[PDB]
């Protein structure tokens, strides 16, 4: 519910990042830089502190659980748009909280960062992700074809996106 | 009276902590000497990069028993004009207790008494008139409706600019 | 007319003269990035310990055949807010043609068109009315009337503030 | 008839002209630079970044032509995003084909790379066709994507395959 | 059984005491180390080259158990050296053959390569036949290679390629 | 008469300040720092480049002579002071130069620069000087002893000044 | 009774809160500050600086007392600027004539000084009588010359002679 | 014939060096770094000037036209070994002079850098190259099989080598 | 015997107090890559300053249970000409124990086996004839008697410099 | 007696070194850089570390009291000289210690070291001083005129000095 | 006649070949240099440094006579060694005298400094009575001081006042 | 004789070709401050990286009419224990000259009269006995005969290591 709140991100964060990455199984990026170990994150967390075109932010519950990170990566102002990413962790899937998270991505990037485009990437492989972008009103505009390397094959991905304007109504 | 207890300290690394824990109620997004920030880490390294930077001065609001009350801030200062903006804060739970106009008295009387300055101006939003009306009464007075200046809290607002001379402050 | 010749490409070190020939003409404190200068040799250090500042972006004005004509200069700029202060300054062997116009129409095409922004502002004193007009008829509208803002040729002077906002520039 | 060269620091005035024209915000390794002098610095500052990489056309009387840009390579996925300028004065010439060619060839022969993919305005159909013909295929059609000349346009992103390109 | 980790700061004692035992010359990013502080200041100093990547091999208990390295990455021809390590005490306990694919798997799969290589001593059957029930097929018999241990030995250079492991 | 001309100096008048220094036998100062030769003052000019505490002008007449130096330092911008000192090249001394210029440095110091006071140093020995500066409205605030170390012997100086307000009336 | 002893870094905060009373803009080597962070870089900035020279006051039970800066030292012309500040819990109790003179002595004695001159307010008479009777005399009255707490005051300027001090 | 000098490489040859890549569209490395444009050779040569891990030699006849290019790559100090690599420009090709550069090569080697083992990559689809190593005493210790992505598809490639202690006898 | 279980492992900065107790017996100008030193802050800076350096490569000896026996150092070292001097110290405490030839096989064993040297040297006092007749001992032959070479505690001295080569050290 | 040990200066004994500055009320120097706080020195001392010019002692005796500090200064390679300067702490003075420690310093520098001469400087004002070093057989070799500011005037001190051939015979 | 100029950087040249002829090591704010390079490189180094000053002396067609260093300038004991070299062509022209005072005089009358001494070998008496004759006074008589020319020989330190200077 | 105008003046930048120009008649590795070269540009470099060293120091012969005659190097010196080993080549062009003995002596007259040392030592390749006879011929003496010590044109060598001291450069 609104149990969930949202954080900027600190130092103190990386190790659970971190953690959000062994079960993934792919290359993991930070600022377009890949980076597997903790000491690789650190390092670049440290030289792109000042930099402007990603931002993310840890989602926390009232007891201060870590519930997964909303991202918003390539960030460009002067088309005023921005690519958006979350990972919900394992233990906290499956429990009605991607929408609610969608929804204050697309509030703060909205409302707070005054952004005119948000889209994201999903594999085609990801009906069900899908349909929930869908439901909250991101419509495809594009099918990559072998856009990416992930698990022994090259994968096709749905680019989706909603506009500031049909937000805000 | 109790606000005759309100002391001015001048900022540094250890206050960094309150600093942040202020922007977390704005919901607008704060600066350092003209760069935005949102996480504490973003904060330290900016003032550290700022440290030696005379275009903004900031000073801390104690109580006699060094409660933690608020923050005066002075910006985008010519020496040249001998112009600043400033700015106020008040921690949350200090609200109730009508400090502003002390420490409005505190910046004015840093800025003309000591720091030998012209002119202080400051922004309001068109949408919060008690602030208004609370600046107008140490002397302030409007000088532009600025139109659509900041983008704010889902919309582009207009805002008050308020100035006040040092003569006039001084001139009895 | 011969209005539609004239061309804007970025500043670069080379044209660093043409610049501080025009401070010697204007009388007036010239900044650098927010850096008062007086000789060319202040000029051409902040120049270069400004070259990566996208705080300000700068646009020389050459004819067909690339006399000099005039500056035209973009400071103070978020792209938080998406605004920014606008200036421009015509060579005077060059004003006797009514060239200004044509550039304002430049500086509000560019910074509409491609810098994407949302208003821009510019200063004009009281006492340059011939100024006011001329801005007034390009859609620009008084948002300020700044008391004492600049020290200026002895004293300190009243400014008008001036905008135009992005959708009014582009709404048939 | 024409030559593809790597682009040298000499090369710089002609890629700065081809903006001033082009009429858009202008990107060396994603930095922005209008300046000269901010183009020469970036340059130096990315001289040995592979992610990147520009080659120069130049003709008989060694003449500048046009530019071929591999941006955004990336040697995980093997992909990367083509753009070609040529300058207005050589603009209907016919040139483009081979040149769209020899960048592909250079991306898949020498780079070994699996996919490229570029951007191409809607409002440019003229375009989108000759990509066509060059074995491009629209895999998205980005809605108010850029704000180009005073509105967000619309975009194709479009795209060709080395297997492809080597067995075509 | 066992985890395959992203090496960090903390494993260095752990490489670093796999080399007193090994017996040769010990390289980090090319650069020799003899050290403990060699060793430390080199990683820093290669926190983020690509051409190298090592993978820690804990347990259960969260003991310390091996050393997977691909060296001489190269992203342009899709190739790496690649060498595993495991420490005296597990030695014969069976889980190379394990580490040796999760290894391949992490190249072919994760890093999207073309083909692993590694050189083993002819002196060395016993490893020679191990890597072979993997899939590597020796390509190489280089002669009096490597001074190792007194003399120039002799090496079996071996090796998979992707699509032989994909397709396998 | 208006003649005379103030410039503002770059590094090629370099040259010129070092040879109003041969002359003078007293030691030379750049930003509160000692000097002897061309080399120390063209390091010192560069590293002060971007300094606000001294300002310098050239006079050069309508033909461009080089006829002096207008120089302001210890400026003080909180008490909004500056000290001004004043050198006529040997050749063109005694021509009734300097009013014009003293006055043209008040007026730069109260006009432009929008200074509160401008004060200056002369030996008690230049009678002179002392009355010159008087008939330009500086007043007498201190007779200061043995303050300088000039030629083999401790000197006196008269410390003179004038207030923005005396001189725009 | 009190130790005259040169300033630590341990001192900083003591210097530092004798300006929040003091009541003017504070400066270390001619350089502003109003930070504990501003001063704590200035003073290693000019640690070794010879211009400024700095003795911190102390007495018995080590409490810190007041501070003697001699600031403009010149070792052409062998002058130098003296202030003294004594915090005000310790003001009355009449140290400075003492301080005064260690300060004097160290100028003259040990620093081979020639002339040593300080400002006074001259809406403090008291303070100029103390300084006359440690041989301080007027040199120069300087009109409006500081601007203090609102207006543009006027300042005693006042020194003593070596030659003065140690024949007198 | 003795015609052909050896020596060592300078700044001025690298305008040389460049021309000797074009006609070879393939990868071109120095120092295990890969350049295409002059800039980027002359910024790597600079970096590794004082870099013992290759070394090379241009190859002028008595009038001072340039031959080719003979380098020594991946020179190990421990296992004293080398590979080495040979260029001949397009038009002094097909001329008889490859042997005396090889057998040149060879002579700095192992008299004078003392090395006990050069190696070299051949293409499989070079049998006349293949065979000319061969007869200048190189045997073949390993068929690599698609070792290197050269010009549209993986290619295996001759790994050949030579003894010191063969050469010398 | 027991000396089959001294072990060789490359010095590290936490081994540098064992080294500075080494020189306090030693009486003579201790050097690090050809530097004096007489403190431990001397010596530990040093250390710093030629971490990176292959001209002398040092091992620290101990025993099974890590009681810290000696060093052995080798420095001076070409690869063109594959030339080293080598050095051996052993604690006092230990040199009742004729551990000597034991760490001369490892130093030699790795000059030759690993490091794959040619030569190895070293120089050994006239006046220390012990030392010499367990060099000898150990395959290495005298190669030159130097005439006050090395300034030692109050005059100059002579020594032997004394070799051995990989090929002697290695066939059977 | 055979008591007092010699040891070289580490970090920590900075505090003992700056405490024989207090009473000594005179300046105090570090290769030539002159300077009174705790941290002017330290600095000082990290800046000097690797510095040849001068070499320091501390005097400890069995217990490891502090005693004194012997220490050479100006130490010249090519002139084999050195200056030397020795500080007895306050409570160990007057205990007969200086002559093993002007021993112990000349042991030093003619048998470590190599040097050809040591020589010091005594105030005239210091008969005592002066025929100590005499009885360990130094000799004056020079009255230096007002050489000095110590202590509210110009003093005069002796130069004193012992070969190497004397000491060691 | 002969004019005394600071030293600038074009006189260097002059400055390293009185070093080829005088015949013993060359320093340069006392750090030593054979090289014209390291004499440039340490001139740079020291531009600022207030420790040693020279001044070279011209003549009216300007030529390159001879040089004037203070050295070892001490600004608390208010002394400086001082050194004179005039170049072998212009050896007995009689410039001496008057240079040894302008540098007496500048020491004195400019530079505030109350004591100057040099060093002349015992050697040489001609210099020695030289100097006597300009005021310099014999104060020691350093006993094999300096290694010169194969020896270890003996110099008079020799001096004067400001005060004696001044008011002779 | 015509030896006596022989000079000898510090090496500098602007003498490093003649430098180069003495190792393509050498055949064997150069180096500079222990580190070899082959290239110009490497020799340069090194150069620079090794302008401030005390380790060597090398003077240029030049004739009354400055054509450049040969070298005179000295390298690996302690002042520690004053010895130093040095170094002779001359060009080729003027090796019918008999110009040997006159450098050495400039060489050791440099280092025992000047640099104050105590020892010069130098190699000589067994191979090369009229160097030998020559150096005995200023007073060298033989002190090694070092096995196998450099890697030479094809072999390692063997050479004579050989010296002289200052005193009996010196004593009459």
Same mark, same amino acid.
């Given at each position: 519910?609104?149990?969930?709140?949202?954080?900027?991100?600190?130092?103190?964060?990386?190790?659970?990042?971190?953690?959000?990455?062994?079960?993934?199984?792919?290359?993991?990026?930070?600022?377009?830089?890949?980076?597997?170990?903790?000491?690789?994150?650190?390092?670049?967390?440290?030289?792109?502190?000042?930099?402007?075109?990603?931002?993310?932010?840890?989602?926390?519950?009232?007891?201060?659980?870590?519930?997964?990170?909303?991202?918003?990566?390539?960030?460009?102002?002067?088309?005023?748009?921005?690519?958006?990413?979350?990972?919900?962790?394992?233990?906290?899937?499956?429990?009605?909280?991607?929408?609610?998270?969608?929804?204050?991505?697309?509030?703060?990037? $909205?409302?707070?960062?005054?952004?005119?485009?948000?889209?994201?990437?999903?594999?085609?492989?990801?009906?069900?992700?899908?349909?929930?972008?869908?439901?909250?009103?991101?419509?495809?505009?594009?099918?990559?074809?072998?856009? $990416?390397?992930?698990?022994?094959?090259?994968?096709?991905?749905?680019?989706?996106?909603?506009?500031?304007?049909?937000?805000?109504?």
């Amino acid at each position: 519910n609104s149990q969930l709140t949202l954080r900027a991100l600190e130092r103190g964060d990386l190790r659970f990042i971190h953690n959000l990455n062994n079960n993934r199984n792919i290359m993991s990026y930070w600022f377009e830089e890949p980076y597997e170990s903790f000491d690789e994150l650190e390092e670049l967390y440290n030289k792109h502190i000042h930099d402007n075109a990603e931002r993310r932010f840890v989602v926390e519950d009232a007891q201060k659980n870590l519930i997964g990170l909303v991202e918003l990566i390539e960030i460009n102002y002067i088309h005023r748009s921005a690519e958006f990413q979350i990972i919900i962790a394992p233990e906290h899937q499956g429990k009605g909280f991607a929408r609610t998270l969608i929804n204050r991505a697309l509030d703060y990037s $909205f409302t707070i960062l005054n952004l005119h485009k948000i889209y994201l990437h999903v594999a085609v492989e990801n009906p069900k992700a899908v349909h929930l972008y869908e439901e909250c009103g991101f419509v495809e505009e594009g099918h990559l074809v072998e856009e $990416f390397f992930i698990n022994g094959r090259y994968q096709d991905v749905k680019r989706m996106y909603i506009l500031q304007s049909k937000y805000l109504n």
